[PDB]
Design a protein around this ligand. Structure first.
Ligand SMILES: Cc1nc2ccccc2c(-c2ccc3c(c2)CCCO3)c1[C@H](OC(C)(C)C)C(=O)O
Ligand SMILES: Cc1nc2ccccc2c(-c2ccc3c(c2)CCCO3)c1[C@H](OC(C)(C)C)C(=O)O
Lengths: 215, 216
């Protein structure tokens, strides 16, 4: 539930211009930008560009100083992103391997930035030599879109949760208490119990008009 | 294929020229204000765009950045390829749409370049379709999803397409004409000749690739 919407960004201290890298921590997607001059404000316009390609719920910050800039914090509010208080070192090292391929292309491009963007293209559209069903370069907007189906799902889940159906086991003075209902059918209605299990006929089952909680 | 192509038109505003990178199918746009405008400059944003997503192709009947042979070469390192009446009208309108949006964002923002950037998160966010949302910005993660699912399956389809199986039919009648199997189930297999949707028991047939088990 936590992994979604989460993005980790690493600053790069580099020959020539400084640069910073942005990845959904799970996705592995990379959109690094070469930094002409470093200001949190400067950091922000890109972070602003970063949101359109993908939404980020929040970003943890490597640097308290990139954190200190008022604009940098200012951006977290427009976004609604909250600044959050070995392997990532290996990810920067992967950026270094990327820098090595960037070295392989260093001859190819005078502009270090080009190399970095290429390196980004390199993390992207990348397939493991070990067989992988899913490419990490093929980070899935979809697994973020499944939950997107999930939000609508929970939404459907909430309306069912909103309805309470009450039933009576047959020939029972007692009337069975409210519980989430597993299914609705014209022939039969299925119900769910916690610390108990039950299912029911549709006639014992009843139909309710929608009562909505917290608009 | 429609997802692969991206279509780009850029118009200068207040002198400074914004770079614009619409994906038509998505309807998503990524635009970057360029410190300086050149074809090479045009090239860099595309490289960034390539990092966010693959593009099969883009079309310009001609562009100045496009004329610069340099812009093409990049699309190639990329593997993207340089190149609907109701749609043809909309594209200029979309370019225009952000600007009307920009005038509002302007009263909002001190710096136009940032502002244009601002217009987009919103542009994606608004949904044209319903009270339920079918925003083009919304559409893209699914669109990406659809194509994604297609490939893993298509490959299954290819691996499958190659694998083939004979049918006995009546035993005495010549056993078969091998047809590509539609499916496998225990004690049976779904197969079709390209003449008729067929089904049969496990015993009736064995299944190595017709042109079989090529290490490949
Ligand atoms: C300056 C420059 N001049 C060129 C002249 C003709 C053809 C290509 C270039 C490229 C270039 C473009 C795309 C690209 C790569 C290199 C290298 C491989 C990936 O795609 C660059 C590059 O610079 C810009 C990106 C600013 C244009 C570079 O740094 O080499
Ligand atoms: C110059 C400038 N000075 C500031 C001083 C204090 C606080 C914020 C800013 C902002 C700013 C930052 C984020 C942002 C918006 C505006 C506007 C809404 C979206 O987020 C800008 C902006 O300039 C930069 C983007 C270069 C920092 C601006 O264009 O006004």
């Amino acid at each position: 539930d936590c992994s979604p919407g989460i993005w980790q960004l690493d600053c790069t201290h580099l020959e020539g211009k400084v640069i910073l890298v942005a990845v959904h921590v799970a996705s592995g997607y990379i959109e690094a930008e070469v930094i002409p001059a470093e200001t949190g404000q400067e950091t922000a316009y890109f972070l602003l560009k970063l949101a359109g390609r993908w939404p980020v719920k929040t970003v943890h910050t490597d640097n308290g100083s990139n954190f200190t800039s008022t604009t940098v914090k200012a951006a977290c509010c427009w976004a609604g992103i909250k600044q959050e208080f070995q392997s990532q070192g290996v990810i920067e090292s992967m950026n270094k391997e990327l820098k090595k391929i960037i070295g392989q292309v260093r001859d190819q491009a005078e502009h270090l930035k080009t190399a970095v963007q290429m390196a980004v293209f390199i993390h992207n559209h990348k397939r493991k030599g070990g067989i992988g069903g899913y490419s990490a370069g093929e980070r899935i907007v979809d697994i973020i879109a499944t939950d997107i189906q999930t939000k609508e799902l929970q939404k459907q889940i909430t309306k069912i949760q909103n309805f309470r159906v009450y039933y009576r086991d047959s020939r029972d003075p007692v009337w069975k208490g409210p519980a989430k209902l597993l299914w609705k059918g014209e022939g039969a209605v299925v119900i769910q119990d916690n610390s108990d299990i039950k299912v029911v006929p549709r006639r014992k089952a009843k139909i309710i008009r929608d009562y909505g909680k917290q608009m």
